[PDB]
Ligand binder design. Sequence first.
Ligand SMILES: [Mg+2]
Ligand SMILES: [Mg+2]
Ligand SMILES: [Mg+2]
Ligand SMILES: [Mg+2]
Ligand SMILES: [Mg+2]
Ligand SMILES: [Mg+2]
Ligand SMILES: [Mg+2]
Ligand SMILES: [Mg+2]
Ligand SMILES: [Mg+2]
Ligand SMILES: [Mg+2]
Ligand SMILES: [Mg+2]
Ligand SMILES: [Mg+2]
Ligand SMILES: [Mg+2]
Ligand SMILES: [Mg+2]
Ligand SMILES: [Mg+2]
Ligand SMILES: [Mg+2]
Ligand SMILES: [Mg+2]
Ligand SMILES: [Mg+2]
Ligand SMILES: [Mg+2]
Ligand SMILES: [Mg+2]
Ligand SMILES: [Mg+2]
Ligand SMILES: [Mg+2]
Ligand SMILES: [Mg+2]
Ligand SMILES: [Mg+2]
Ligand SMILES: [Mg+2]
Ligand SMILES: [Mg+2]
Ligand SMILES: [Mg+2]
Ligand SMILES: [Mg+2]
Ligand SMILES: [Mg+2]
Ligand SMILES: [Mg+2]
Ligand SMILES: [Mg+2]
Ligand SMILES: [Mg+2]
Ligand SMILES: [Mg+2]
Ligand SMILES: [Mg+2]
Ligand SMILES: [Mg+2]
Ligand SMILES: [Mg+2]
Ligand SMILES: [Mg+2]
Ligand SMILES: [Mg+2]
Ligand SMILES: [Mg+2]
Ligand SMILES: [Mg+2]
Ligand SMILES: [Mg+2]
Ligand SMILES: [Mg+2]
Ligand SMILES: [Mg+2]
Ligand SMILES: [Mg+2]
Ligand SMILES: [Mg+2]
Ligand SMILES: [Mg+2]
Ligand SMILES: [Mg+2]
Ligand SMILES: [Mg+2]
Ligand SMILES: [Mg+2]
Ligand SMILES: [Mg+2]
Ligand SMILES: [Mg+2]
Ligand SMILES: [Mg+2]
Ligand SMILES: [Mg+2]
Ligand SMILES: [Mg+2]
Ligand SMILES: [Mg+2]
Ligand SMILES: [Mg+2]
Ligand SMILES: [Mg+2]
Ligand SMILES: [Mg+2]
Ligand SMILES: [Mg+2]
Ligand SMILES: [Mg+2]
Ligand SMILES: [Mg+2]
Lengths: 148, 155, 144, 185
Amino acid sequence: PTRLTKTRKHRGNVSAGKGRIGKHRKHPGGRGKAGGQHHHRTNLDKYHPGYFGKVGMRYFHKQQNHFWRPEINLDKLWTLVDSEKKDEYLSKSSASAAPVIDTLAHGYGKVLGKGRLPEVPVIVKARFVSKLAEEKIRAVGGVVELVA
Amino acid sequence: QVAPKWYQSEDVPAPKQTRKTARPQKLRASLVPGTVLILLAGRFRGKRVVYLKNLEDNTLLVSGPFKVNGVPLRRVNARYVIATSTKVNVSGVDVSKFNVEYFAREKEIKAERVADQKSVDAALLSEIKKTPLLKQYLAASFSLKNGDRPHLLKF
Amino acid sequence: RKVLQLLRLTQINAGVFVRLTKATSELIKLAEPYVAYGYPSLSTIRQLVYKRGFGKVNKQRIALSDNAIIEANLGKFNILSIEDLIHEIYTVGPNFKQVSNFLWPFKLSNPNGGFRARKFQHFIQGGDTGNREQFINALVKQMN
Amino acid sequence: GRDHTSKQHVRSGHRTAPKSDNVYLQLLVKLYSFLARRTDAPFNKVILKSLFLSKINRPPVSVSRISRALKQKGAAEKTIVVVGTVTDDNRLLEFPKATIAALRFTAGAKDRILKNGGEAITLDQLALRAPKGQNTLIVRGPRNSREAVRHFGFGPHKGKAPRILSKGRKFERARGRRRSRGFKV
RNA sequence: AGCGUGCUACUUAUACUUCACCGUGAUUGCUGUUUUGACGCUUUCACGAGUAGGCAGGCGUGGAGGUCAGUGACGAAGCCUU
RNA sequence: UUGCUUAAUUGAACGUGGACAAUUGAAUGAAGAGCUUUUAGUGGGCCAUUUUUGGUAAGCAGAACUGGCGAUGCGGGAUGA
RNA sequence: GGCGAAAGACUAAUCGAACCAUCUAGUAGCUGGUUCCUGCCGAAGUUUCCCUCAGGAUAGCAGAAGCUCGUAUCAGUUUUAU
RNA sequence: GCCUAGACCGAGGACUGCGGUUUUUACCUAGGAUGUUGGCAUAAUGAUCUUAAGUCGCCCGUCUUGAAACACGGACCAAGGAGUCUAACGUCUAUGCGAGUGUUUGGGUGUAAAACCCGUACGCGUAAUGAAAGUGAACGAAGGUGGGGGCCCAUUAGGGUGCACCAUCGACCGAUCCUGAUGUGUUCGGAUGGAUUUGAGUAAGAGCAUAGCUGUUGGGACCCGAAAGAUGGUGAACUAUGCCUG
RNA sequence: GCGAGAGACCGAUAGCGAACAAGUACAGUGAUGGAAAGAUGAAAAGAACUUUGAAAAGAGAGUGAAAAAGUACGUGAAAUUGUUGAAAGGGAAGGGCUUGAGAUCAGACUUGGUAUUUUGCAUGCUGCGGUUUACCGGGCCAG
Ligand SMILES: [Mg+2]
Ligand SMILES: [Mg+2]
Ligand SMILES: [Mg+2]
Ligand SMILES: [Mg+2]
Ligand SMILES: [Mg+2]
Ligand SMILES: [Mg+2]
Ligand SMILES: [Mg+2]
Ligand SMILES: [Mg+2]
Ligand SMILES: [Mg+2]
Ligand SMILES: [Mg+2]
Ligand SMILES: [Mg+2]
Ligand SMILES: [Mg+2]
Ligand SMILES: [Mg+2]
Ligand SMILES: [Mg+2]
Ligand SMILES: [Mg+2]
Ligand SMILES: [Mg+2]
Ligand SMILES: [Mg+2]
Ligand SMILES: [Mg+2]
Ligand SMILES: [Mg+2]
Ligand SMILES: [Mg+2]
Ligand SMILES: [Mg+2]
Ligand SMILES: [Mg+2]
Ligand SMILES: [Mg+2]
Ligand SMILES: [Mg+2]
Ligand SMILES: [Mg+2]
Ligand SMILES: [Mg+2]
Ligand SMILES: [Mg+2]
Ligand SMILES: [Mg+2]
Ligand SMILES: [Mg+2]
Ligand SMILES: [Mg+2]
Ligand SMILES: [Mg+2]
Ligand SMILES: [Mg+2]
Ligand SMILES: [Mg+2]
Ligand SMILES: [Mg+2]
Ligand SMILES: [Mg+2]
Ligand SMILES: [Mg+2]
Ligand SMILES: [Mg+2]
Ligand SMILES: [Mg+2]
Ligand SMILES: [Mg+2]
Ligand SMILES: [Mg+2]
Ligand SMILES: [Mg+2]
Ligand SMILES: [Mg+2]
Ligand SMILES: [Mg+2]
Ligand SMILES: [Mg+2]
Ligand SMILES: [Mg+2]
Ligand SMILES: [Mg+2]
Ligand SMILES: [Mg+2]
Ligand SMILES: [Mg+2]
Ligand SMILES: [Mg+2]
Ligand SMILES: [Mg+2]
Ligand SMILES: [Mg+2]
Ligand SMILES: [Mg+2]
Ligand SMILES: [Mg+2]
Ligand SMILES: [Mg+2]
Ligand SMILES: [Mg+2]
Ligand SMILES: [Mg+2]
Ligand SMILES: [Mg+2]
Ligand SMILES: [Mg+2]
Ligand SMILES: [Mg+2]
Ligand SMILES: [Mg+2]
Ligand SMILES: [Mg+2]
């Protein structure tokens, strides 16, 4: 609402809050990112270091679908087990019958190894796993089965 | 417009308990019964009169005497009076019956008041005659003459 | 300016009691062109405390109109009366600091009779500032 | 005139009331204004101040923080007080039986608390079973974990996060972030 | 009624002292009498210059939702007027 | 305690345990201390005392410290930033 | 572009580049203006960089919002020691 | 110690307090003015307007170190007249839900641009780091030390527990450098142990969405203002010059 | 372009340039440029008639709810101006503060209470104005 703006409060005061010396002008200092190397260097150097220059190699025609690989950690892995059957699985899981967790079918490419698993065997199906994620899965008596 | 609210009461609080216990008035040392006074204000301003009694209203009972002056028995305020140094012996004048209720508001003048005037003025005149020219002095009006400075005059 | 602030003299005609040591004397020497001081008698202290005595109670300026006010704030320092406070100031006592800081700075009037013709020169040179040493009592009588 | 040793007419700089116009938060302030004014219990004065706080000053408290606070020695049966929202944590392996008083509970948080035999009560229910905050334990969430705090105090050699819209090799990584491109700050 | 010097009194600033009132900041207390206002009432103390500028609380105008079963041809709105 | 140091059982740094309680180690004061975010205007200055450079000097030009004017009315200097 | 026995002359009161419409609300570190009330706080003309010197960015000065706490250990001051 | 002259003021509004005199569970001068009298109510009293007198008072706005200026705009009056909207954002605040969040591209539905309902995807978040190939976050009660509100036990003090947060020493992940186990497409692999190195990381998530103020950038961009530049057209009724005919 | 329905839009200096005989009047050789301008009253009932005047008009009259609606038309502000009235005024005027004077406005004999007599009510003496002297007390200005 315009009735809440300070434009309504500046009515009657000559300069509308812009100053009598400074005299609000069109574009003192330039337009946009003008003078970033000359008179706005003190701003870009302080607040945006790394702005100028090239780093790394180009990639013509980069298709981001190639690099799709969402991560799921181990402390979040049992959320992919059915909620209505999690508690039964946490009790009756053994080497003979352990829950299967299809991580790709839930939208994940790599299993990472942050956190702790329940000391319960699981079968984790993944495209990729980290070294520590698979070590933690095997320690609880589980296994990682690679899929594609 | 802003309507009155329910919490805007109209009850009048009682006053707090006041500690202004009155104490009696103190008259000037020059105000002694029998003193000749000069009236400064009122109808009888400038009249020289005899001071008789201190009423309980903080006023002074005063007579001309009426025969000498035309100023009857009445009250005056001590602050509208110059207390001179001339004195008349009023020990023989009975002013017992005179008080605030005597001068109560009820032209025609009461027979009681005329009788009291005559009885008081008889004794007043008997004592006034002793001092020569005192009756003539009381019958003459007071005024400030050219070159009279009341801050330098003795009364 | 800082010295006058540390003496709690932040207005004209404000008075305060100071216990003389080397430190406080060297403080007062810095404020000398702006203050008049001297050695106060017992009757001057009593008149000051009786007429213009106020206490600092919860950072508020409270009149010393009852001995309970003084006791509630200075009873742990064995001050139970206005006369205990006056004695503690006069014969500079072991608890002079607390008793004098409890006293709000005295707010005096202008002198009845005026100052000398020109205030802001030393009392020795015919002015009003500096140490006048027993004539502070006459000045306080003028101003209190 | 006065020689002012401090700025005149300065407001305290603390909230004396909630900015919220929620009438039910104002009922809680009414209840704890009475408790803080009259019980001498320091707990009630802290709760009254916390009810004034803004949203970022009342970060969510995960059900894992409460679990860790109940694992303090001699705190297993204390009443957990959270002036704010209690959220769920699907990274817990187990949750104890506990009494928790909060402004709000998420659906998952309340479900897990009640599933394990505990209570999820409001701050007014707290004031009747503990009008002096007896046997309580106030839990506060992390304030400096907020994303906005990453960029506070940015400067050379400060190690903070730049205010930037895109992330990648082409966005503020060359000159001033690399010795091969001039200098590094 | 000049110059140097001393003294007494006296004159008066929006300054100082006491008091009233306004506002701001802090502060005292208020639910078995909290009692149809607790965003309220109440105790106490201190303070108040201001350009550029910031913020707060209000006044006024066109139109919109709601409400006053509001005013009005027995005179709306507008306009003039110690 | 150590992988440092010493010829060393020597030290260096950080510690467990024990003793020294409000005169806990000068004064005075303290409308409390500490912390953070965000944004405005400004980036022509000038004057007075004292120090001071150039200049014969200047209501001149240039610095130092403080206080002022700018941004400020009020009493005095007749008048006057 | 014309035309000029040449003056930058003349080319419809227009000429060192006509007139009309449009691009076009061209851009302006420059000049001018910028509309109600009260309350509270309240500056800077200085640092560094800039084809920088009538301008910016930066730091400082200012406001606002607060937050953590409640005398904790601070000060445009003195003293003592060095 | 005592006597004495005058001026200004009267905030508060049952009681509560501190004292004093006690002849007394009473009285007082002691937590803020009462008593009494007169007059007036066709009025004494108060306010405003006009005017006189006394005293003070330069023309506003503006840029400026400095304006009443012999600096600029303003003869007068009415009506109009200048920080807006949008895309993308920073801080803060309110709200809903919360490891999620966002119905509104669309579909359903409708009393028909509304309201109501639906869900897949997608966006942001939940993982970082490296130029990249790539790799990818628990020694421990998610660590130790000094503080730390609150809570618990106490009984000044004292002890226990200590979230947020502050300082500090560590641990984990990525990059860089060093070391280089069993092994092997003999050039690959990279276990293990390290390093005054480095990251916008981990270390029991905090975000997402809507709205508001303020600030930012691009847009006509607070309003008005160039000298210029370009594209496409209209003019030799004036005038310059040639020609034709008088 | 044609045909429709709408709006937290503008309300005659606004909204299209144009609410009207508006791309009109008018300008320019030309390309082009380009306005101003809505409102009597329900209805003309748009003032018959007499009189003064050369006439325009005026004065009577008439219509109308209104002529304080007469086409120079609803309302009819300001600048600016006439008349009447009031006041002030020696090379400006205007302003603030204060009081006087003149003018205006305001307010307690209160919604005053106490008994009292008569004038008036639909009515069967009862709510209650009315009056003057008494008393209680109040308001204001003062000693
Ligand atoms: Mg201003
Ligand atoms: Mg203006
Ligand atoms: Mg501004
Ligand atoms: Mg301007
Ligand atoms: Mg500027
Ligand atoms: Mg005198
Ligand atoms: Mg003098
Ligand atoms: Mg003041
Ligand atoms: Mg983070
Ligand atoms: Mg290179
Ligand atoms: Mg003279
Ligand atoms: Mg002389
Ligand atoms: Mg004053
Ligand atoms: Mg101010
Ligand atoms: Mg509008
Ligand atoms: Mg009606
Ligand atoms: Mg700026
Ligand atoms: Mg700047
Ligand atoms: Mg200059
Ligand atoms: Mg400038
Ligand atoms: Mg200036
Ligand atoms: Mg000044
Ligand atoms: Mg002057
Ligand atoms: Mg002179
Ligand atoms: Mg030439
Ligand atoms: Mg020509
Ligand atoms: Mg423009
Ligand atoms: Mg420039
Ligand atoms: Mg100020
Ligand atoms: Mg350059
Ligand atoms: Mg300029
Ligand atoms: Mg009173
Ligand atoms: Mg003058
Ligand atoms: Mg100007
Ligand atoms: Mg100049
Ligand atoms: Mg000016
Ligand atoms: Mg001049
Ligand atoms: Mg000129
Ligand atoms: Mg100019
Ligand atoms: Mg002009
Ligand atoms: Mg207007
Ligand atoms: Mg999603
Ligand atoms: Mg994502
Ligand atoms: Mg990657
Ligand atoms: Mg973390
Ligand atoms: Mg232009
Ligand atoms: Mg042009
Ligand atoms: Mg060009
Ligand atoms: Mg021709
Ligand atoms: Mg339409
Ligand atoms: Mg138009
Ligand atoms: Mg038009
Ligand atoms: Mg019209
Ligand atoms: Mg005729
Ligand atoms: Mg009419
Ligand atoms: Mg009409
Ligand atoms: Mg008309
Ligand atoms: Mg007029
Ligand atoms: Mg003349
Ligand atoms: Mg007058
Ligand atoms: Mg008068």
